[PDB]
């Protein structure tokens, strides 16, 4: 390759230290709320070649990535790559990232505790939720 | 309170056809399948028991077996006993549970709280 001279050895995108030397299509996965498929379908509309790394970029590319990344409907990331489809409050097809991700997980758990449902007491107790066969499991992390 | 961008007065004034896009996959699935006559009659007993109550007072609790009832938002504010095999658990239907079943509110078994092994 070449030696790109603007190489930030640390990236800071949305309250996350990103190892900027990693591949761009696999360093966006490092934050919560974005996986592998999702950052790829971002970059196919974020108009950055996959050949580059994550520290080889311009901030104009960074600001258009974060622009598409917070405006997922307006840049043709349609409503199945989204982290949350229909919220409890607004039902708005919208991506939810790391701080808001833990916030909305906490929101749903606090809701189901307040609901007094079969799920909410499991989530307060920290047990299995999807009806598992624990006749041989439940080993690591139980005391 | 708001559900899916729709309010409580907005939901309770909304028709039965337009509910069927505002729910989950199983719930829109079952409302496509169409409710049974038993659940119709249970909602009718809920109408009679929610109407005849004094205006300060919460309605008289109606007990029921049918754990597989979709909590319609029209039921919000009532008190329903849900049968989990042994005991009618009496739940006040708050508006936070309009997208769930009754059957999750009367938790059916008792949680395992271990002892100690004897002869294993």
């Amino acid at each position: 390759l070449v030696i790109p001279e603007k190489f930030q050895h640390i990236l800071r995108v949305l309250n996350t230290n990103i190892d900027g030397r990693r591949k761009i299509a696999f360093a966006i996965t490092a934050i919560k709320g974005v996986g592998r498929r999702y950052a790829h379908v971002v970059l196919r509309k974020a108009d950055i070649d996959l050949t580059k790394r994550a520290g080889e970029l311009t901030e104009d590319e960074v600001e258009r990535v974060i622009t598409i990344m917070q405006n997922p409907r307006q840049y043709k990331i349609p409503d199945w790559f989204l982290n949350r489809q229909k919220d409890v409050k607004d039902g708005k097809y919208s991506q939810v990232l790391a701080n808001g991700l833990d916030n909305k997980l906490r929101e749903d758990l606090e809701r189901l505790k307040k609901i007094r449902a079969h799920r909410g007491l499991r989530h307060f107790w920290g047990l299995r939720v999807r009806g598992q066969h624990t006749k041989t499991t439940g080993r690591r992390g139980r005391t | 309170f708001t559900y899916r961008g729709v309010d409580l007065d907005q939901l309770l004034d909304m028709s039965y056809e337009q509910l069927m896009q505002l729910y989950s996959a199983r719930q829109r699935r079952r409302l496509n399948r169409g409710l049974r006559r038993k659940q119709h009659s249970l909602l009718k007993r809920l109408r009679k028991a929610k109407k005849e109550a004094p205006p300060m007072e919460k309605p008289e609790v109606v007990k029921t077996h049918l754990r597989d009832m979709i909590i319609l938002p029209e039921m919000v504010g009532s008190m329903v006993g849900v049968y989990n095999g042994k005991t009618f658990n009496q739940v006040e239907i708050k508006p936070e549970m309009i997208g769930h079943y009754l059957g999750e509110f009367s938790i059916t078994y008792k949680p395992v709280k271990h002892g100690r092994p004897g002869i294993g």
Binding site: - | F88, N89, K110
Partner: peptide, 14 residues
């Protein structure tokens, strides 16, 4: 903070 409605059963689930 047990509800005035429900039994001791769900309250043991609380």
């Amino acid at each position: 903070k047990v509800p005035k409605g429900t039994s001791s059963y769900q309250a043991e689930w609380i």
